[PDB]
C-alpha cells in the first residue's frame, strides 16, 4: 500500500528517459547537438511545447544536462520558454531558472533573468517537500534554491533582478528557516549573515528573523528543536550584551526572553523536552542554557522535589498500613472444599468498622482515596485532552512513570468499589496497588546524583537486554515444561509434586530456570530414567549457558551506554524543573534572572555569567602574526595507530 | 574564498571569536590593540591603523567576518591533505562544527570495541592537541593520521 | 538554599552599568570621547568625586574600560584621583594602578607611576580572597597582580619604582606562594626565576623561599599540599647535588631537610596524607620521595607492621575463646511460654569463677579488657585534641578503620559492665564485638601487595556501588513484602510460614531477593492464585534483573578505577609508615638517611641515589 510509492517514482524516471530518445529535439537537447537544433527549428511541425513524461521542454533538458550552447539556440527560437512550469504529480512549478540555479553554476541564470524570468515560481510538488522521502529539501522559491546550494555569486545576482527575500512556503518556512535544517551547517552560517544584509531594515513588523512558520516557531527556536548546535551558537551572539573584561575575566549578559520559561507562550525549554531527534538534547549543554537549568535546580528545583518526595512517601505508608490492618473474619462453614486443596482459614468482613481501632483506619483509608483522586485530576486531564488511546500516542510511549501512577490511582478506586459493593476478590487489586505504589518511589530518585543514573539503566534493561532474553526464555520453558510434565504424568505426585498440572509445570520449570527453587529429587524412590537425562540437558542450557550469557549481555551494554545515561539523567532534571515550574503557582517560584526595569535595560530578563576565559599565547600568536603586516604517551600513541590502520583500511 | 571547505571556516570562526571581545562581528582598531598588548609587544596606535586599513575593502574600519575570511586566504596556511582523511573526519565529527570532542572520541572507540577508560581518552588529546585547548582541530587530526 | 551572594553581586554588576549611563562624564569615560571630556571638565560642576556603584571614579572606569586618551585628560585636570581607592565591599582598596596592571600592559602604568601611584596598596576586598566564590586569586599587591598574569615588563618596572619583594597578604601568602597555586603551571616557572633573582639582599632572615605563610607552609611545602607537580620538580633543582659522573651512571644527593619528619614539625610526607586533593598524590612518585617511602617501608616499616599485626592476631584469639567458653548454666524456669514457639534452654550465670578452668579463663578476660583500654587511650585522645569527630574524623569520613577499632573497644567494656552488674542478654554486645573484632584483621592487609589493592575495592564498592544499590533494594522489597504479606494473611501459617507476621515478611522477602533461601512452595496444599503471579514478577526484579545488574555495575567500575586503586594503595603505605614513626618510641627506628656531619656538608640529613640515563 505504501511501497507502490517507491516503484511509481522509479517508473517516471525511466519513462522520462524513453521520451527523450523517441524525440528529435529532446535527444538533440540531451547532448549539445548545436548543428541539429538549427536543423530542426526551421521546420513547421516541430512542437516546441512538446510535453514529455513530466512536462519537460527542450530548455529544461538543456539545463538539467547543463548544455549552455544548446540553451542559447532555444531561447532565440521559442519566446514562451522561460515560462511553462511542469505539470505531473512529481516536480511542479519548477522552471528552467530553478534548474540553472541548483547546479551551483550556470551562465544560463544570467541569461534567463534577461529574458524576463519568473522569480515567484512556487516549485510545489511531491518532490520538494521535506519527509522521510526525497533526499533534499531546498525550498520553494528561486532564492531558497540559491541559498542552500552554497551559491554566494547567485544570491547577489538574484536580489538585484527583483527577488523576494521574505516570502514563505507551504509549510510556512521563510528563507532563513530553510538554511537551518540543511546538513551542511558551517556554510549555512555564512549564508545566514548574507541574507540578513539584504534586509535593509524593512518596516515589515519584526524583520525576518522573528517571523514564525505555520507551527509558530522563530529561526532561533528552529536551531534548538532540530538540533543545530552550530546555528544555535551563532544565533546567540546577537543576544549577549558583554559588560566588562577585567583582564582574564569577562562578564557577559545573556537575554532570557526566549530561552527562559515565559508565560503561556511555549518557551524553548518546553520544546526540547517534548521532542525526538536526540541531537536536540545537545542544546542543554550550551553556555546560556546549562547555567540556567543549574540555577533553577539548586535553588528552587531540588527543595520542592524533596517536599514532594516526602509527602508521597508518607502517603504510601498511610496506604500500606491500611492494607496490613485490613478487616479479616474467620472461616464460616467448615472447610467445605476437600482436604489437601484448601488451607484458607479467614475471610473478608462484609462491613465492620464498629470498634475504635477501625475509625483510626477510616481516617487513614479516606486519605488514600482523596489522594487517589488528586492523582487523577492532574494527569488525567492530559489523557482527557490529548486522546484516550488512539489519539494518545505521545505520553504512553514517552514517560514510563506516567503509566505506573495512573495505574496506582486506578487500583485504589477499584478497591473503593469492592469495599462498598462488598465483593470478594480484594486481595488482587491491593496486590497491584502496593507494588505499583512503592515503585513510584523510584521516580523520586532522579534529583539525587547518586541514584539518578541508576534508574536510567533499569529502564534500558527492561526495554532492551531483558525482553531480548524473555522471548528465548519462554521458548525454552514451554519445551522443557511440556517435557517434564509428560514424564511425571505417569507417576505418583506425592513425593515429587512439581509436575502434576500443566499450569503448575510451567511454574516449577520457570523457577528451575532461575534456580530459585532446588530441584526435583527424592533419593528414596528410583526416578524415571528419562528424567535424569532431560533435566541434565535443562541444567546446562539454563543455569550454565543462558543465565550466564544474560550476565554477559548486561555487562557488555553497561560500558557501552555509560556516558549516554549521564546525558539522559541531566535531561531529566530539565524535564522535572519545567514540570515543577508549570504546576506550582508563581508565588513559590520566582522567575529566574534579573529584571531590567530598575536597571534600565527594558522589560526583558537577563542572566549574568562570568568566566575566567583562557590563555594559549601559541594560538593567538599564529593569527596576530598574520595580522602583523608592513610512559602514558607510549600507551596513548599505541592507541592512535590502532585507530589509524583501523580507519584507513575501511 | 572560492576553495574554503567547512573545516577551515569552522576554525577561523572560533579564531574570530576569542579575538573579538565585544560579541559582535566588528573588529575595532582598539580591540585589535587589546590582543597585541597581551602578546607582550606594544602597538603605536598608527600600527593599529596600518593593519586595519590594509584590508578593509568596504571602508568602515571594522573588520567583518567575510573581510576576515578573505584575509586569511591572503595569509593562507596551506592546502595539502588526502580525500579519505577529510571524509573520515566528518564521520567522527557528529555536530558538524569542525572539532572532535572528548565524548566524540569515546564514541569512536566504543564502535571499535577497544574498552577505553576516561583517563586515556584525555591522554589521547594531549598528544593530538597543538595549541593547547583540549579540542582537536582538523590540522591537528591530519597531523596525527599520517605523521606523529 | 538560595545563593544570595550570587544575587548580591548580580544586583551590583548591573547597577554599575546604570550609574555610568546616568552620568555625563562616566559615559564619556567608558568610550574615549575626548571632545566630551574637555567640555565637562571646564565648567565647575564637574563633581570629580562622582562615586559609582562599586566605589569607582572616572579614573577607575578609564582604566577598566581601556581608554588611554581619557585617562590622560583625567590625570591632567584633576590629579588627585590617583590617590583614590574604591570603597564598596567587594572591591575594597583597589586603586587605579591595580586595574591597569591586570589589563596586561598600558602606557598608563608609566603614566600612573609618573604621577605618584601607590606601588604598595592593599586590594583587601572580598572579591580577592581565595574561595570557591571568586574566579581569580591574584593576591593583594600590584607586583602580585603583574606576576600572576605573566608580564615581565611590568614586574621589572615596579621594583624600579619601589615594590616590596616580600610583602605578605591576608593569608600570609607572599609573592612566591601565589605563583605556585596559579592554574598556568608552565609560565609560573618562568616568573619564579625572575622573582627570586631580584632579591639579592644581605637582610635574608629566612630569605625569600624559607618564609612561611600564616598556616606555616614554606613555598616548597606549599606545592606539596596543593599539587603543582610542575612546580615541584623545579624546586628540587636547588636541593640536589651532583656527586660524580662515571659514564652513563650518575649519583646525586637529595636534601631531606624539608621532606623527612624529624620529630617535631609537620613535614611534606605528613601534609600530603592529611589533605584530600587527588592532584596532591603524584608527589609520592617523584625522584626524592619514592625512595624515602620505600626505604622506610622495606627496612623498618614492614617488619614492625607485621609484628604489630601478629600481636593483634593473637589478641583476638584470646577474645574469641573467652566467648566460646562462656559461663552458661541450664534453664531454671519451666518453659511454659508456648513450646509451639520456644527453643531456649540455657541461661546466663551470675558467679561462675570457681573452677580451675574458669581461673584460666579469668586470665583471658583480663587480657582483652586491658587491651580494650589501651585502644581507647591511643586513639580516643586523638579525636579529643585534633578535631571533634571531623578533623581527625576524616577517618570517620574516609578510611573507616578508626571507627571500627573504637567500636570494638567500646563494646568490650559494655560486655564488662553487663557481666559485673549482671544484666540481661550478654550476646548482644558480644555478637557485634566478634564481627567488629575480626574485620580489623583487614586493616593489616595493606602491607601485603596481594591483599593491598583488594581492600580498597571493598571500600569503593560499599560506598557507592552497593550503597546506591540498597536504596533501590528497600524500594523493591517494601513493595513486595507488603504485597506478599496481605496474600498470605487469610491463610494457614503452620505450612508455608514465610509470611506469618510483618517483621518476618521483611526477612523472607529479603532472602528471596538474594536467593539465600529457596522459595515459598508447599505442594499438597493449593496456594492462592494471586501469589504465583506476584512471585513471578518478584522472580524477575530479582535474581534476573536487579542482581545481574549489580554484577555488571561492579564489573564496570572494577576496570574504570583500576589506575586509581593502585595509587590509592601506595598512599596507604605513607599513611602507615609515618603513623608508626610518631606512635612508636624513637629508640628502635633509625633515622632514614646519611648524616652530613661526619663527612661535612652541614647538619642536614641526605639520601643518595644512582641511575642510568644513556
Ligand atoms: C512538608 C512535609 C515534609 C517536610 C519536610 C521533609 C524534609 C525534606 C525537604 C527539606 C530538605 C530537602 C534538601 O534539600 O535535602 C535533601 C536531602 C539531600 O540533600 P543534600 O544536602 O545531600 O544535597 C547535596 C548534593 N551534593 C552532595 C551534590 C552537594 O535528602 C533528603 O533529606 C530527602 C528527604 C526524603 C526524600 C525521599 C525521596 C525518595 C527516595 C527514593 C530512594 C530510591
Ligand atoms: C499527609 C501525610 C500522611 C499522614 C497520614 C496521617 C493519618 C493517620 C493514620 C495513619 C495510618 C493509618 C493506619 C493505622 C491503622 C491501625 C493503627 C493501630 O491500630 O495502632 C497502631 C499499631 C497497633 O495496632 P494493633 O491493633 O495491632 O495493636 C494491638 C493492641 N490491642 C492488643 C489493644 C488490640 O501500632 C503498632 O504496632 C505499629 C508500630 C509503630 C510503627 C508505625 C509507624 C510507621 C513506621 C515508620 C515511619 C517512618 C516514616 C519516615 C521514613
Ligand atoms: C514473554 C512471552 C511469554 C509467552 C507466553 C508463555 C506462557 C503461555 C501461558 C498460557 C496459559 C496461562 C493461563 C492459565 C490458564 C490456562 C492454562 C492452560 O494452559 O491450559 C491447560 C492445558 C491443559 O492442562 P491441564 O493439566 O490443566 O489438563 C489436564 C487434563 N487431564 C487431567 C485429562 C490430563 O494445557 C495447555 O494449554 C497446553 C497448550 C500449551 C499452552 C501454552 C502454549 C501457547 C502459547 C505459547 C507462547 C508463544 C511463544 C512465542 C515465542
Ligand atoms: C610475637 C611477635 C612476632 C610474632 C610473629 C612473627 C611475625 C614475623 C616476624 C618478623 C618478620 C617480618 C617479615 O619478613 O614478614 C614478611 C612476610 C612475607 O614477606 P616476603 O619477603 O616473603 O614477600 C616477598 C615480597 N617482597 C620482596 C616485595 C617483600 O610476611 C609474613 O609472613 C607475616 C606473617 C604475619 C602477618 C599477620 C597479619 C594478619 C593479616 C592477615 C591477612 C588479612
Ligand atoms: C598477645 C598476648 C595474648 C596471649 C596471653 C596468654 C593468655 C593465655 C590464657 C588464656 C587464653 C584464653 C583461653 C580461655 C579458655 C581456655 C579453655 C580451657 O580452659 O581449657 C583448655 C582447653 C582444653 O580442651 P577442652 O576445653 O575441650 O576440655 C575438655 C577435656 N576433654 C577434651 C578431654 C574432653 O584447651 C583448648 O581447647 C585449646 C584449643 C586450641 C586453640 C589454640 C589456638 C590455635 C591458633 C594459634 C595461633 C595460630 C598462629 C597465628 C599467627
Ligand atoms: C538502606 C535503605 C533503607 C532501608 C530501611 C528499610 C525499612 C526498615 C524498617 C524498619 C527497621 C527495622 C526494625 C524492625 C522492627 C520494625 C519493622 C517495621 O518496619 O514496622 C513493623 C510494624 C509492626 O507491626 P505489625 O504489622 O507486625 O503488626 C502485626 C500485624 N497484625 C496486627 C495485622 C497481625 O508494622 C508496620 O509499622 C508497617 C509499616 C510499613 C512501613 C515501613 C516503611 C519504611 C519507611 C521508610 C523506608 C525507606 C524508604 C525510602 C528508601
Ligand atoms: C491526601 C494527602 C496525603 C495528599 C496527597 C497528595 C500527594 C501525596 C500526591 C497527590 C498528587 C501527587 C503528584 C501528582 C503528579 C506527579 C507527577 C508525576 O510525574 C511523572 O510521573 C512524570 C514521569 C515522566 O515525565 O516520565 C510523578 C508523581 C507526582 C509528583 C505526584 C506525587 C505525589 C502527589 C503530590
Ligand atoms: C510478562 C512478564 C511478567 C514476564 C514474562 C515471562 C514468562 C515466561 C513467565 C512470567 C509470567 C509467568 C506466568 C504467570 C502466571 C502463571 C499462572 C500460574 O499457574 C497457576 O495458577 C499455578 C497454580 C498454583 O500456584 O498453585 C503459574 C504459571 C504461569 C502460567 C506463569 C508461567 C511463566 C510465565 C509465563
Ligand atoms: C563433553 C561431555 C563429557 C559433557 C559432560 C556432561 C556430563 C558430565 C554429564 C552430562 C549428561 C550426564 C548424564 C545424564 C544422565 C545420566 C543417567 C543417570 O541415570 C541413571 O543411569 C540411573 C537410573 C535411575 O535413576 O534409576 C545417571 C547419570 C547420567 C549418566 C549423567 C552423568 C553425567 C553426565 C554424563
Ligand atoms: C593486653 C595486651 C595483649 C594488648 C595488646 C595490644 C593490642 C591488642 C592493641 C593495643 C593498641 C592497638 C593499636 C592501637 C592503634 C592502632 C591504630 C589503628 O588505626 C586505625 O584505627 C585507623 C587509622 C588509619 O586510617 O590509618 C590501627 C590499629 C592499631 C595499630 C592498634 C593495633 C592493635 C593494638 C596494638
Ligand atoms: C536430551 C534431550 C531431552 C534434550 C537435549 C537438548 C539438546 C539435544 C538440544 C536442545 C536445545 C538445542 C540448542 C538450542 C539452540 C541452539 C542455538 C542455535 O543457533 C543452534 C542450535 C542450538 C545450539 C541447539 C543445539 C541442540 C540443543 C542443545
Ligand atoms: C551489624 C553487625 C552485626 C555487623 C557489622 C557489619 C558492618 C557494620 C561492618 C562489618 C564489615 C565492615 C566492612 C569490612 C571492611 C571494609 C573495607 C574498608 O576498606 C572500608 C570499610 C569496610 C567496608 C567495613 C565497613 C563496616 C562493615 C560493613
Ligand atoms: C503483576 C503484579 C502482581 C506485579 C507486577 C509488577 C510489574 C508489572 C511492575 C511493578 C514494578 C515495575 C517496574 C519498576 C521499575 C521500573 C523502572 C522504570 O525506570 C521503568 C519501569 C520499571 C521497569 C517498572 C516496569 C513494570 C513493573 C515490573
Ligand atoms: Ca537452594
Ligand atoms: Ca570591536
Ligand atoms: Ca568591514
Ligand atoms: Ca564536535
Ligand atoms: Ca586544538
CSV table of C-alpha atoms in Angstrom, one decimal, chain C residues 322-553:
chain,number,residue,atom,x,y,z
C,322,UNK,CA,36.6,-16.3,76.2
C,323,UNK,CA,33.4,-16.1,74.1
C,324,UNK,CA,33.4,-19.7,73.1
C,325,UNK,CA,33.8,-20.9,76.8
C,326,UNK,CA,31.2,-18.5,78.4
C,327,UNK,CA,29.8,-19.2,81.9
C,328,UNK,CA,26.4,-20.7,80.8
C,329,UNK,CA,24.1,-22.7,83.0
C,330,UNK,CA,20.9,-24.7,82.1
C,331,UNK,CA,17.5,-23.2,82.3
C,332,UNK,CA,15.9,-22.9,85.7
C,333,UNK,CA,12.4,-21.7,84.7
C,334,UNK,CA,9.8,-24.1,83.4
C,335,UNK,CA,9.4,-23.4,79.7
C,336,UNK,CA,5.6,-22.8,79.6
C,337,UNK,CA,5.6,-19.9,77.1
C,338,UNK,CA,4.4,-22.0,74.3
C,339,UNK,CA,6.8,-24.8,73.2
C,340,UNK,CA,5.0,-24.3,69.9
C,341,UNK,CA,7.1,-21.1,69.7
C,342,UNK,CA,10.1,-21.5,72.1
C,343,UNK,CA,13.5,-23.1,72.0
C,344,UNK,CA,15.5,-21.5,74.8
C,345,UNK,CA,17.2,-23.9,77.2
C,346,UNK,CA,20.2,-22.2,78.7
C,347,UNK,CA,20.6,-19.1,80.9
C,348,UNK,CA,23.4,-16.7,81.9
C,349,UNK,CA,25.0,-17.5,85.3
C,350,UNK,CA,25.9,-14.8,87.9
C,351,UNK,CA,29.0,-16.0,89.7
C,352,UNK,CA,30.9,-18.8,87.8
C,353,UNK,CA,34.6,-18.0,88.6
C,354,UNK,CA,35.2,-21.0,90.8
C,355,UNK,CA,36.5,-23.9,88.6
C,356,UNK,CA,40.2,-24.0,87.6
C,357,UNK,CA,39.0,-23.8,84.0
C,358,UNK,CA,37.4,-20.5,84.8
C,359,UNK,CA,40.5,-19.2,86.5
C,360,UNK,CA,42.4,-19.9,83.3
C,361,UNK,CA,39.5,-18.1,81.5
C,362,UNK,CA,39.7,-15.2,84.0
C,363,UNK,CA,43.2,-14.5,82.6
C,364,UNK,CA,41.5,-14.4,79.2
C,365,UNK,CA,39.0,-11.7,80.1
C,366,UNK,CA,41.8,-9.7,81.8
C,367,UNK,CA,43.9,-9.7,78.7
C,368,UNK,CA,41.0,-8.5,76.5
C,369,UNK,CA,39.8,-5.8,78.9
C,370,UNK,CA,43.2,-4.3,79.4
C,371,UNK,CA,43.7,-4.4,75.6
C,372,UNK,CA,40.4,-2.5,75.2
C,373,UNK,CA,41.7,0.2,77.4
C,374,UNK,CA,45.0,0.6,75.5
C,375,UNK,CA,42.9,1.1,72.4
C,376,UNK,CA,40.9,3.9,73.9
C,377,UNK,CA,44.0,5.7,75.3
C,378,UNK,CA,45.9,5.9,72.0
C,379,UNK,CA,43.1,6.8,69.6
C,380,UNK,CA,40.3,8.5,71.6
C,381,UNK,CA,42.8,11.2,72.9
C,382,UNK,CA,43.5,11.8,69.2
C,383,UNK,CA,39.9,12.9,68.5
C,384,UNK,CA,40.0,14.9,71.7
C,385,UNK,CA,42.6,17.5,70.7
C,386,UNK,CA,42.7,17.4,66.8
C,387,UNK,CA,39.1,17.7,66.0
C,388,UNK,CA,35.6,17.0,67.4
C,389,UNK,CA,34.9,13.9,65.2
C,390,UNK,CA,35.6,15.8,62.0
C,391,UNK,CA,39.2,16.9,61.6
C,392,UNK,CA,40.8,13.7,62.8
C,393,UNK,CA,37.3,12.4,62.0
C,394,UNK,CA,38.4,12.3,58.4
C,395,UNK,CA,38.7,8.6,59.2
C,396,UNK,CA,35.1,8.9,60.2
C,397,UNK,CA,34.8,10.4,56.7
C,398,UNK,CA,37.2,8.1,54.8
C,399,UNK,CA,39.3,5.1,55.6
C,400,UNK,CA,36.8,3.7,58.2
C,401,UNK,CA,39.2,1.5,60.2
C,402,UNK,CA,39.5,4.0,63.0
C,403,UNK,CA,35.7,3.8,63.8
C,404,UNK,CA,35.7,0.0,63.9
C,405,UNK,CA,38.6,-0.4,66.5
C,406,UNK,CA,36.9,2.2,68.8
C,407,UNK,CA,33.6,0.4,68.4
C,408,UNK,CA,35.4,-2.9,69.3
C,409,UNK,CA,36.9,-1.4,72.5
C,410,UNK,CA,33.6,0.4,73.2
C,411,UNK,CA,31.8,-3.0,73.4
C,412,UNK,CA,34.3,-5.0,75.3
C,413,UNK,CA,33.6,-2.6,78.1
C,414,UNK,CA,29.8,-3.0,77.7
C,415,UNK,CA,30.5,-6.7,77.8
C,416,UNK,CA,32.4,-6.0,81.0
C,417,UNK,CA,29.6,-3.8,82.6
C,418,UNK,CA,26.9,-6.3,81.8
C,419,UNK,CA,29.0,-9.0,83.4
C,420,UNK,CA,29.6,-7.0,86.6
C,421,UNK,CA,26.1,-5.8,87.5
C,422,UNK,CA,24.7,-9.0,85.9
C,423,UNK,CA,22.2,-7.5,83.5
C,424,UNK,CA,20.1,-9.3,80.8
C,425,UNK,CA,21.4,-10.7,77.5
C,426,UNK,CA,25.1,-10.6,77.0
C,427,UNK,CA,25.0,-12.0,73.5
C,428,UNK,CA,24.2,-8.5,72.0
C,429,UNK,CA,27.5,-6.7,72.8
C,430,UNK,CA,29.4,-9.9,72.0
C,431,UNK,CA,27.8,-10.5,68.6
C,432,UNK,CA,29.0,-7.1,67.4
C,433,UNK,CA,32.4,-7.5,69.1
C,434,UNK,CA,33.3,-10.6,67.1
C,435,UNK,CA,32.3,-9.3,63.7
C,436,UNK,CA,33.9,-5.9,64.5
C,437,UNK,CA,36.9,-7.5,66.2
C,438,UNK,CA,37.8,-9.9,63.3
C,439,UNK,CA,37.1,-7.4,60.5
C,440,UNK,CA,40.0,-5.3,61.7
C,441,UNK,CA,42.4,-8.0,60.5
C,442,UNK,CA,41.5,-6.5,57.2
C,443,UNK,CA,43.3,-3.4,58.5
C,444,UNK,CA,46.5,-5.4,58.5
C,445,UNK,CA,46.3,-6.3,54.8
C,446,UNK,CA,47.7,-3.1,53.3
C,447,UNK,CA,51.3,-4.1,53.6
C,448,UNK,CA,50.9,-7.3,51.6
C,449,UNK,CA,50.8,-6.4,47.9
C,450,UNK,CA,48.4,-9.3,47.1
C,451,UNK,CA,45.9,-8.2,49.7
C,452,UNK,CA,46.6,-4.4,49.4
C,453,UNK,CA,44.6,-3.2,46.4
C,454,UNK,CA,41.7,-5.6,47.1
C,455,UNK,CA,40.8,-4.0,50.5
C,456,UNK,CA,40.5,-0.7,48.5
C,457,UNK,CA,37.9,-2.3,46.3
C,458,UNK,CA,35.8,-3.5,49.2
C,459,UNK,CA,35.6,0.2,50.3
C,460,UNK,CA,34.8,1.7,46.9
C,461,UNK,CA,32.3,-1.0,46.3
C,462,UNK,CA,30.4,-0.4,49.6
C,463,UNK,CA,30.3,3.5,49.5
C,464,UNK,CA,28.8,3.9,46.0
C,465,UNK,CA,28.2,0.7,44.2
C,466,UNK,CA,26.5,-1.3,46.9
C,467,UNK,CA,25.2,1.7,48.8
C,468,UNK,CA,23.3,3.1,45.7
C,469,UNK,CA,22.0,-0.4,45.1
C,470,UNK,CA,20.4,-0.8,48.5
C,471,UNK,CA,18.2,2.3,48.1
C,472,UNK,CA,16.6,0.5,45.2
C,473,UNK,CA,16.6,-2.7,47.2
C,474,UNK,CA,14.5,-1.2,50.0
C,475,UNK,CA,12.1,0.3,47.4
C,476,UNK,CA,11.5,-3.2,45.9
C,477,UNK,CA,11.3,-5.3,49.0
C,478,UNK,CA,9.0,-2.9,50.8
C,479,UNK,CA,6.7,-3.2,47.8
C,480,UNK,CA,6.7,-6.9,47.6
C,481,UNK,CA,6.9,-7.9,51.3
C,482,UNK,CA,3.8,-5.8,51.9
C,483,UNK,CA,2.3,-7.4,48.8
C,484,UNK,CA,3.3,-11.0,49.9
C,485,UNK,CA,2.0,-10.4,53.4
C,486,UNK,CA,-1.6,-9.5,52.6
C,487,UNK,CA,-1.9,-12.5,50.3
C,488,UNK,CA,-0.7,-15.0,53.0
C,489,UNK,CA,-2.9,-13.3,55.7
C,490,UNK,CA,-6.2,-15.1,55.1
C,491,UNK,CA,-4.4,-18.4,55.2
C,492,UNK,CA,-2.8,-21.2,57.3
C,493,UNK,CA,0.5,-20.2,59.0
C,494,UNK,CA,1.9,-23.6,60.1
C,495,UNK,CA,2.5,-24.6,56.5
C,496,UNK,CA,4.5,-22.1,54.4
C,497,UNK,CA,5.1,-19.8,57.3
C,498,UNK,CA,7.3,-17.4,55.4
C,499,UNK,CA,4.9,-14.5,55.9
C,500,UNK,CA,3.1,-15.1,59.2
C,501,UNK,CA,3.9,-11.7,60.7
C,502,UNK,CA,5.3,-8.5,59.2
C,503,UNK,CA,8.8,-8.3,60.6
C,504,UNK,CA,9.3,-11.9,59.3
C,505,UNK,CA,7.8,-10.9,55.9
C,506,UNK,CA,10.6,-8.3,55.6
C,507,UNK,CA,13.1,-11.0,56.2
C,508,UNK,CA,11.7,-13.7,54.0
C,509,UNK,CA,11.4,-11.3,51.1
C,510,UNK,CA,15.0,-10.0,51.7
C,511,UNK,CA,16.2,-13.6,51.4
C,512,UNK,CA,14.2,-14.3,48.2
C,513,UNK,CA,15.8,-11.2,46.7
C,514,UNK,CA,19.3,-12.7,47.2
C,515,UNK,CA,18.4,-16.5,46.8
C,516,UNK,CA,19.7,-17.4,50.2
C,517,UNK,CA,16.6,-19.4,50.9
C,518,UNK,CA,14.6,-21.5,48.3
C,519,UNK,CA,11.2,-20.0,47.8
C,520,UNK,CA,7.7,-20.5,49.2
C,521,UNK,CA,6.5,-23.7,47.7
C,522,UNK,CA,4.2,-26.1,49.6
C,523,UNK,CA,2.7,-28.6,47.2
C,524,UNK,CA,-0.1,-30.9,48.5
C,525,UNK,CA,-1.9,-27.7,49.5
C,526,UNK,CA,-3.1,-25.2,47.0
C,527,UNK,CA,-1.6,-21.7,47.2
C,528,UNK,CA,-3.9,-18.7,46.3
C,529,UNK,CA,-3.9,-17.6,42.7
C,530,UNK,CA,-2.5,-14.1,43.2
C,531,UNK,CA,0.7,-15.5,44.7
C,532,UNK,CA,2.1,-17.2,41.6
C,533,UNK,CA,1.6,-14.0,39.5
C,534,UNK,CA,3.2,-11.7,42.0
C,535,UNK,CA,6.1,-14.1,42.8
C,536,UNK,CA,6.8,-14.4,39.1
C,537,UNK,CA,7.2,-10.7,38.9
C,538,UNK,CA,9.4,-11.0,42.0
C,539,UNK,CA,11.3,-13.7,40.2
C,540,UNK,CA,12.4,-11.1,37.7
C,541,UNK,CA,13.0,-7.9,39.6
C,542,UNK,CA,15.3,-10.1,41.4
C,543,UNK,CA,17.8,-12.8,40.6
C,544,UNK,CA,17.2,-12.0,36.9
C,545,UNK,CA,17.2,-8.2,36.6
C,546,UNK,CA,18.5,-6.5,39.7
C,547,UNK,CA,21.1,-9.0,40.8
C,548,UNK,CA,22.8,-9.4,37.5
C,549,UNK,CA,22.8,-5.6,37.0
C,550,UNK,CA,24.9,-5.4,40.2
C,551,UNK,CA,27.4,-7.9,38.7
C,552,UNK,CA,27.7,-5.6,35.6
C,553,UNK,CA,27.9,-2.4,37.7
